[PDB]
Amino acid sequence: GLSDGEWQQVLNVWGKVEADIAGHGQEVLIRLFTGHPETLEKFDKFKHLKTEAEMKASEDLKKVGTVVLTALGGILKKKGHHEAELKPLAQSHATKHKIPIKYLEFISDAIIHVLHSKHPGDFGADAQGAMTKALELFRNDIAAKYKELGFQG
Ligand code: HEM
Ligand SMILES: O=N[O-]
Ligand SMILES: O=N[O-]
Structure with a gap:
């Protein structure tokens, strides 16, 4: 798992997210859906949207993005005891x-991308390696639970 210094840096950049959780949620999902259109098919509420303008206009998409990032900051704040x-x-x-576990990888990449783009002064080379390892830990622990639940992710 991560050292104390690594967790510090994950929690530092996560504070900058908390300051506008919704706006971050939106940019995360839009990055995900534009990079990987097949992931959009998973969301029955707004899987019919086609454009970035439509995605920014959607109140549903915004609420979903907030929920994901809020649930994720809860987990990160547990520093592995999640x-x-x-x-x-x-x-x-x-x-x-x-x-699928692969889609959890795609959203990890989206989060990393948005963090880098919005908060580069809080997200340099070390902090990005730290967040990368923290999101690996999350996916790896989720995959272990998929197995017991009978889902081949
Ligand atoms: C950081 C990774 C993620 C976290 C922390 C997360 C968290 C959550 C939470 C808290 C909810 C609402 C409660 C629930 O259904 O459990 C949810 C709903 C949902 N998630 Fe995830 N999620 C993640 C990744 C993904 C990915 C990558 C996809 C699809 C490609 C996905 C698809 C969905 C769908 C379809 C819902 C129902 C959405 C709705 O209310 O319309 N999730 N997620
Ligand atoms: O709705 N979670 O990506
Ligand atoms: O969204 N990943 O570059």
């Missing part, structure tokens, strides 16, 4: 919405 928080997320993403 079993309790990870359980419900694993369950819903393995049963209700079947999210």
